[PDB]
Design a protein around this motif. Structure first.
Motif, PDB file in Angstrom:
ATOM      1  N   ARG A 228      38.176  63.697 -35.538  1.00  0.00           N
ATOM      2  CA  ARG A 228      38.306  64.353 -34.309  1.00  0.00           C
ATOM      3  C   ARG A 228      36.997  65.444 -34.292  1.00  0.00           C
ATOM      4  N   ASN A 229      35.957  64.744 -34.270  1.00  0.00           N
ATOM      5  CA  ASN A 229      34.714  65.693 -34.122  1.00  0.00           C
ATOM      6  C   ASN A 229      34.652  66.173 -32.718  1.00  0.00           C
ATOM      7  N   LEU A 230      34.561  67.470 -32.208  1.00  0.00           N
ATOM      8  CA  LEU A 230      34.432  68.123 -31.225  1.00  0.00           C
ATOM      9  C   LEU A 230      33.478  69.412 -31.340  1.00  0.00           C
ATOM     10  N   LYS A 231      32.559  69.540 -30.595  1.00  0.00           N
ATOM     11  CA  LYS A 231      31.974  70.902 -30.250  1.00  0.00           C
ATOM     12  C   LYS A 231      32.927  72.314 -30.132  1.00  0.00           C
ATOM     13  N   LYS A 232      32.537  73.378 -30.147  1.00  0.00           N
ATOM     14  CA  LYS A 232      33.330  74.561 -29.521  1.00  0.00           C
ATOM     15  C   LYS A 232      33.869  74.487 -28.221  1.00  0.00           C
ATOM     16  N   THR A 233      34.662  75.364 -27.449  1.00  0.00           N
ATOM     17  CA  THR A 233      34.848  75.490 -25.997  1.00  0.00           C
ATOM     18  C   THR A 233      33.585  75.426 -25.352  1.00  0.00           C
ATOM     19  N   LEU A 234      33.758  74.419 -24.198  1.00  0.00           N
ATOM     20  CA  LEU A 234      32.449  74.359 -23.228  1.00  0.00           C
ATOM     21  C   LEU A 234      33.151  73.724 -21.932  1.00  0.00           C
ATOM     22  N   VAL A 235      32.567  74.039 -21.045  1.00  0.00           N
ATOM     23  CA  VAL A 235      32.926  73.555 -19.604  1.00  0.00           C
ATOM     24  C   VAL A 235      31.592  72.873 -19.027  1.00  0.00           C
ATOM     25  N   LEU A 236      31.795  71.804 -18.212  1.00  0.00           N
ATOM     26  CA  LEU A 236      30.861  70.888 -17.782  1.00  0.00           C
ATOM     27  C   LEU A 236      30.923  70.971 -16.268  1.00  0.00           C
ATOM     28  N   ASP A 237      29.543  71.288 -15.478  1.00  0.00           N
ATOM     29  CA  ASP A 237      29.641  71.202 -14.207  1.00  0.00           C
ATOM     30  C   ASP A 237      29.215  69.819 -13.742  1.00  0.00           C
ATOM     31  N   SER A 238      29.500  69.502 -12.484  1.00  0.00           N
ATOM     32  CA  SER A 238      29.175  68.412 -11.587  1.00  0.00           C
ATOM     33  C   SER A 238      27.765  67.802 -11.998  1.00  0.00           C
ATOM     34  N   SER A 239      26.699  68.764 -11.984  1.00  0.00           N
ATOM     35  CA  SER A 239      25.497  68.211 -12.219  1.00  0.00           C
ATOM     36  C   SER A 239      25.513  67.665 -13.656  1.00  0.00           C
ATOM     37  N   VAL A 240      26.129  67.877 -14.534  1.00  0.00           N
ATOM     38  CA  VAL A 240      26.242  67.411 -15.819  1.00  0.00           C
ATOM     39  C   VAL A 240      26.447  65.800 -16.116  1.00  0.00           C
ATOM     40  N   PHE A 241      27.381  65.466 -14.948  1.00  0.00           N
ATOM     41  CA  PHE A 241      27.613  64.074 -14.795  1.00  0.00           C
ATOM     42  C   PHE A 241      26.567  63.483 -13.590  1.00  0.00           C
ATOM     43  N   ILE A 242      25.606  64.518 -13.110  1.00  0.00           N
ATOM     44  CA  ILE A 242      24.710  63.710 -12.272  1.00  0.00           C
ATOM     45  C   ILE A 242      23.550  63.236 -13.477  1.00  0.00           C
ATOM     46  N   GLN A 243      22.945  64.079 -14.093  1.00  0.00           N
ATOM     47  CA  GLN A 243      21.906  63.788 -14.877  1.00  0.00           C
ATOM     48  C   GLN A 243      21.961  62.625 -15.953  1.00  0.00           C
ATOM     49  N   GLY A 244      23.128  62.414 -16.483  1.00  0.00           N
ATOM     50  CA  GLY A 244      23.464  61.402 -17.589  1.00  0.00           C
ATOM     51  C   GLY A 244      23.549  62.160 -19.049  1.00  0.00           C
ATOM     52  N   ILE A 245      23.987  63.499 -19.136  1.00  0.00           N
ATOM     53  CA  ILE A 245      24.317  64.366 -20.062  1.00  0.00           C
ATOM     54  C   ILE A 245      25.521  63.944 -20.911  1.00  0.00           C
ATOM     55  N   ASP A 246      25.669  63.014 -21.920  1.00  0.00           N
ATOM     56  CA  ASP A 246      26.926  63.126 -22.774  1.00  0.00           C
ATOM     57  C   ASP A 246      27.023  64.176 -23.696  1.00  0.00           C
ATOM     58  N   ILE A 247      27.964  65.005 -23.369  1.00  0.00           N
ATOM     59  CA  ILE A 247      28.470  66.037 -23.982  1.00  0.00           C
ATOM     60  C   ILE A 247      30.117  66.140 -23.764  1.00  0.00           C
ATOM     61  N   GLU A 248      30.935  66.961 -24.441  1.00  0.00           N
ATOM     62  CA  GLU A 248      32.031  67.229 -24.571  1.00  0.00           C
ATOM     63  C   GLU A 248      32.568  68.386 -23.896  1.00  0.00           C
ATOM     64  N   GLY A 249      33.900  68.804 -23.684  1.00  0.00           N
ATOM     65  CA  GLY A 249      34.559  69.929 -23.038  1.00  0.00           C
ATOM     66  C   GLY A 249      35.539  69.696 -22.085  1.00  0.00           C
ATOM     67  N   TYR A 250      35.542  70.541 -21.036  1.00  0.00           N
ATOM     68  CA  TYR A 250      36.559  70.437 -19.817  1.00  0.00           C
ATOM     69  C   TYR A 250      35.684  70.093 -18.582  1.00  0.00           C
ATOM     70  N   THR A 251      36.338  69.632 -17.544  1.00  0.00           N
ATOM     71  CA  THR A 251      35.816  69.158 -16.247  1.00  0.00           C
ATOM     72  C   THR A 251      36.915  69.504 -15.153  1.00  0.00           C
ATOM     73  N   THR A 252      36.436  70.000 -13.770  1.00  0.00           N
ATOM     74  CA  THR A 252      37.260  70.462 -12.775  1.00  0.00           C
ATOM     75  C   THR A 252      37.417  69.550 -12.162  1.00  0.00           C
TER      76      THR A 252
END
Ligand SMILES: [Zn+2]
Length: 161
Positions: free
Chosen positions: A3-27
Motif C-alpha cells: 500500500r504505497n500512497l502519497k499524503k492527503t491530496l485532492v485532484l481536480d477535473s483538469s488533472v483527469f484532462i492532462q493525463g496526470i497519473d497521481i493518487e488522492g480523492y476525486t469529486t
C-alpha cells in the motif's frame, strides 16, 4: 502489503484532462460533467485501482470559498466543480492538484499548498514597473516614467513570481 500512497491530496477535473497519473480523492460532482473518453477511462481506472477515492465537500467548505471569494470580488463567477474540489481540500487541509488560472489563484489566497503543470504563458506577458500612488502595473517605463493614470512616479519592482 504494497500500500504505497502519497499524503492527503485532492485532484481536480483538469488533472483527469492532462493525463496526470497521481493518487488522492476525486469529486463525484465533477465526474458527472466528465464526458470525454481519456478523462473517463483514466479516472474510472485509477478509481478502480484505488489510486483515487470518491469524496464531495461539506457545505461549510463551499461557504469558505464564498467568504474569501466575496472579499476578492468574483464570488460565484467561478464554476461549481472549481469551488467543489478546492473546498474539499480546505476541509482536509491536505493538498490539491490543478492547472487553471482561477483555480491557482483561489488556492493561493486560501493558503492551501498545491501542484500545477508545465505551462508558462498562453496569452499573458511579463512586467517590471509599478506606479507609486494608484499602484498601476506597467511592463515598460511610460514617458517621464510617470503614471498615465494618476500622474505619480513609476519605479522598478522584483520578479513576477
Ligand atoms: Zn498611478
Amino acid at each position: 502489503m504494497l500500500r504505497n500512497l502519497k499524503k492527503t491530496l485532492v485532484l481536480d477535473s483538469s488533472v483527469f484532462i492532462q493525463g496526470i497519473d497521481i493518487e488522492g480523492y476525486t469529486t463525484p460532482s465533477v465526474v458527472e460533467e466528465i464526458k470525454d473518453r481519456e478523462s473517463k477511462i483514466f479516472l474510472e481506472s485509477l478509481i478502480s485501482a484505488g489510486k483515487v477515492k470518491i469524496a464531495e465537500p461539506s457545505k461549510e467548505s463551499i461557504d469558505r470559498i464564498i467568504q474569501v471569494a466575496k472579499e476578492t470580488g468574483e464570488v460565484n463567477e467561478l464554476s461549481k466543480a472549481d469551488i467543489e474540489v478546492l473546498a474539499l481540500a480546505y476541509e482536509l487541509k491536505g493538498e490539491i492538484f490543478s492547472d487553471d488560472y482561477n483555480v491557482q489563484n483561489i488556492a493561493s489566497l486560501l493558503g492551501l499548498r498545491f501542484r500545477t503543470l508545465k505551462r508558462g504563458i498562453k496569452k499573458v506577458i511579463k512586467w517590471r514597473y509599478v506606479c507609486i500612488g494608484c499602484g498601476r502595473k506597467f511592463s515598460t517605463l511610460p514617458p517621464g516614467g510617470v503614471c498615465p493614470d494618476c500622474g505619480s512616479k513609476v519605479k522598478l519592482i522584483p520578479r513576477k513570481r
